[PDB]
Amino acid sequence: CDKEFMWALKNGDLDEVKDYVAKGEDVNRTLEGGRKPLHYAADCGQLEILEFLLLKGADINAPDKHHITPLLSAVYEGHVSCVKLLLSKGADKTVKGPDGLTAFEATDNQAIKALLQ
Amino acid sequence: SDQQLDCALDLMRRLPPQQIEKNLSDLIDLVPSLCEDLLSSVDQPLKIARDKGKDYLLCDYNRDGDSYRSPWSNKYDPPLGAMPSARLRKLEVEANNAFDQYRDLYFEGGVSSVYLWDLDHGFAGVILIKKAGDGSKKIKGCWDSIHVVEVQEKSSGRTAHYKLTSTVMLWLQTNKTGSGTMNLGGSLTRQMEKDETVSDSSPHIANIGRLVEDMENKIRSTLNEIYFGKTKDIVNGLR
Amino acid sequence: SDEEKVRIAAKFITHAPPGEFNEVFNDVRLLLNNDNLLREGAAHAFAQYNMDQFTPVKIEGYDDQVLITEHGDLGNGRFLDPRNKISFKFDHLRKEASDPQPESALKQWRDACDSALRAYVKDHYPNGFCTVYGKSIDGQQTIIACIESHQFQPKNFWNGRWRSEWKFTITPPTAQVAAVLKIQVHYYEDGNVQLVSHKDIQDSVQVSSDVQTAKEFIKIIENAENEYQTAISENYQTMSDTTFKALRRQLPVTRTKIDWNKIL
Ligand SMILES: [Mg+2]
Numbered sequence: 001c002d003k004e005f006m007w008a009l010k011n012g013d014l015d016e017v018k019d020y021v022a023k024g025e026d027v028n029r030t031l032e033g034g035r036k037p038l039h040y041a042a043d044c045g046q047l048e049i050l051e052f053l054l055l056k057g058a059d060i061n062a063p064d065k066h067h068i069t070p071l072l073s074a075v076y077e078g079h080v081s082c083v084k085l086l087l088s089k090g091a092d093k094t095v096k097g098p099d100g101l102t103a104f105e106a107t108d109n110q111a112i113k114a115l116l117q
Numbered sequence: 118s119d120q121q122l123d124c125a126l127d128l129m130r131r132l133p134p135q136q137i138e139k140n141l142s143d144l145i146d147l148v149p150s151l152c153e154d155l156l157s158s159v160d161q162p163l164k165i166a167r168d169k170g171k172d173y174l175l176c177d178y179n180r181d182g183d184s185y186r187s188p189w190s191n192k193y194d195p196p197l198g199a200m201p202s203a204r205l206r207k208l209e210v211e212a213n214n215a216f217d218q219y220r221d222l223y224f225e226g227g228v229s230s231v232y233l234w235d236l237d238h239g240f241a242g243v244i245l246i247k248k249a250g251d252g253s254k255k256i257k258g259c260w261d262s263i264h265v266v267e268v269q270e271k272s273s274g275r276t277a278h279y280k281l282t283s284t285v286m287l288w289l290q291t292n293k294t295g296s297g298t299m300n301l302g303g304s305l306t307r308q309m310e311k312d313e314t315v316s317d318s319s320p321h322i323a324n325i326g327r328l329v330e331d332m333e334n335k336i337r338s339t340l341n342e343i344y345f346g347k348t349k350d351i352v353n354g355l356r
Numbered sequence: 357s358d359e360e361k362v363r364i365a366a367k368f369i370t371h372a373p374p375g376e377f378n379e380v381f382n383d384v385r386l387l388l389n390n391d392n393l394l395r396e397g398a399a400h401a402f403a404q405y406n407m408d409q410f411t412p413v414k415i416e417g418y419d420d421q422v423l424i425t426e427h428g429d430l431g432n433g434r435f436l437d438p439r440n441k442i443s444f445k446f447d448h449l450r451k452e453a454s455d456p457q458p459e460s461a462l463k464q465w466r467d468a469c470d471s472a473l474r475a476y477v478k479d480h481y482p483n484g485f486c487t488v489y490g491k492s493i494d495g496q497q498t499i500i501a502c503i504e505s506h507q508f509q510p511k512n513f514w515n516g517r518w519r520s521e522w523k524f525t526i527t528p529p530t531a532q533v534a535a536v537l538k539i540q541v542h543y544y545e546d547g548n549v550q551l552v553s554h555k556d557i558q559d560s561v562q563v564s565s566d567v568q569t570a571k572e573f574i575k576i577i578e579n580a581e582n583e584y585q586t587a588i589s590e591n592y593q594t595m596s597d598t599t600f601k602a603l604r605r606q607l608p609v610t611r612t613k614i615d616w617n618k619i620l
């Protein structure tokens with residue numbers, strides 16, 4: 001049942017993600033895969049899923065088992081609009097990833113680097 | 118019936134790839150003569166069984182009779198059976214534990230199963246990975262990969278010869294307002310042959326996994342082009 | 357059993373890819389090995405495939421190709437060409453037309469919708485064919501527009517076909533629209549993959565004259581089939597960067613390949 005929630009998060013089926021959380025699930029619980037619902041959404045550039053998880057009370061700075069923040073996850077995969085929303089919602093851009101680098105130091109994306117300034 | 122099996126295989130390559138189970142069953146009811154020859158030649162989706170406590174995948178290389186041996190408990194779920202040698206079974210557990218991480222790092226889920234069997238001058242193994250995208254009415258999909266490796270030792274054992282044959286079955290279905298229902302199904306098969314050194318810092322499993330990883334990365338690249346590029350251009354050519 | 361071997365053989369022929377009917381018929385013939393069971397048992401299957409695939413056929417001396425559809429079935433082994441008001445024998449195995457003979461109430465609207473549809477098909481499809489029917493279904497005046505477009509390139513190891521069926525049920529002053537669009541693509545140059553896509557459409561349109569309603573029908577067909585094709589290409593991109601990744605990624609989350617002696 002954890003994988004099907006992960007499948008809805010990655011593909012952005014907001015209706016399924018809405019039911020799972022409405023049934024009493026924790027938007028901050030690390031799934032068996034090793035990431036929190038914010039990670040799977042930001043990893044796939046799901047802007048509409050990030051907005052829902054955020055106003056539902058998810059920790060915008062929580063790391064996964066890879067020590068990757070939801071902001072760093074979107075930066076690694078090059079999701080510009082997701083980096084824009086996370087920064088606007090207060091994501092801490094000073095956190096270093098598992099390589100000791102901030103989001104600004106870990107990407108060559110000029111669009112993403114401009115947002116991180 | 119050598120030309121009968123030819124038309125039977127030529128029929129499965131042309132039928133909708135999401136109905137292989139019933140087509141092959143209808144195909145065997147039509148001609149029961151080639152019942153055993155077809156099942157050993159037609160690519161079928163991987164079936165899942167429970168150890169009864171992880172899941173494990175069923176195939177012919179881990180089967181003896183009508184029973185299936187689990188790669189975790191090392192016992193057939195229908196109790197009996199053909200067992201691996203104590204030295205090979207030990208190497209098999211390391212293979213399952215190695216490819217269980219490979220499954221998590223590249224698929225973030227699904228089920229994996231590894232089975233080995235001793236030949237004569239070496240051993241051969243099968244790597245089974247199954248990733249299904251259930252739990253959504255709008256987006257579905259599944260990924261089945263079947264790897265068969267043949268290891269051949271060379272004299273002192275510092276270098277060995279590997280022979281890899283992999284098949285990846287890929288299915289996707291979307292139900293959206295604009296594009297309606299879109300269904301993609303099919304497969305792809307590749308063969309490999311290479312020899313690498315076998316030191317203590319790179320055992321057999323480190324060589325087998327290094328060839329399965331590079332192969333699946335190559336197959337994925339070809340699948341992305343024939344699924345979402347080639348068929349797209351054909352659609353736009355129709356209009 | 358022998359009623360079950362033709363039922364299996366008919367189903368296999370029904371699900372043949374576009375442009376691969378002949379190769380599937382031979383595999384079925386050499387498998388059933390009962391040529392008379394196949395000809396009278398699966399006769400309906402050969403007619404079912406051609407009618408479902410909107411098979412275009414060239415009639416001698418009439419130039420414009422006509423589609424074999426369920427709406428053209430006259431119930432006597434013959435098919436109707438509403439453009440040149442004739443009927444003809446059609447052999448579903450050879451896909452040949454023969455024995456033409458001439459062949460009502462809703463005839464003017466069919467001529468109008470046909471004239472508008474032909475120009476639409478020419479402006480949007482390369483080798484496209486169309487056929488418009490006018491008939492009554494359950495006491496309701498109905499206009500049926502059908503579109504077909506295929507590309508058969510076995511030398512390049514791929515085939516495709518587009519189908520469109522538009523049903524306009526005239527209930528003045530309105531007309532209930534029910535449509536289905538279908539695409540089937542088979543690619544086997546390297547590997548093997550088949551696309552199966554469909555879309556159901558329900559709309560409404562106010563009728564007026566035979567000409568104003570005809571161009572308003574084609575307008576609905578044009579806007580819907582434009583969105584269908586455009587949304588398919590946009591969905592192909594989504595399946596490339598998202599749906600495929602949700603099955604297997606290009607790289608791990610760490611974005612580095614696996615250190616294999618760090619696992620053992
Ligand atoms: Mg840099």
Ligand SMILES: [Mg+2]
Pocket residue numbers: 356480
């Ligand atoms: Mg065009």
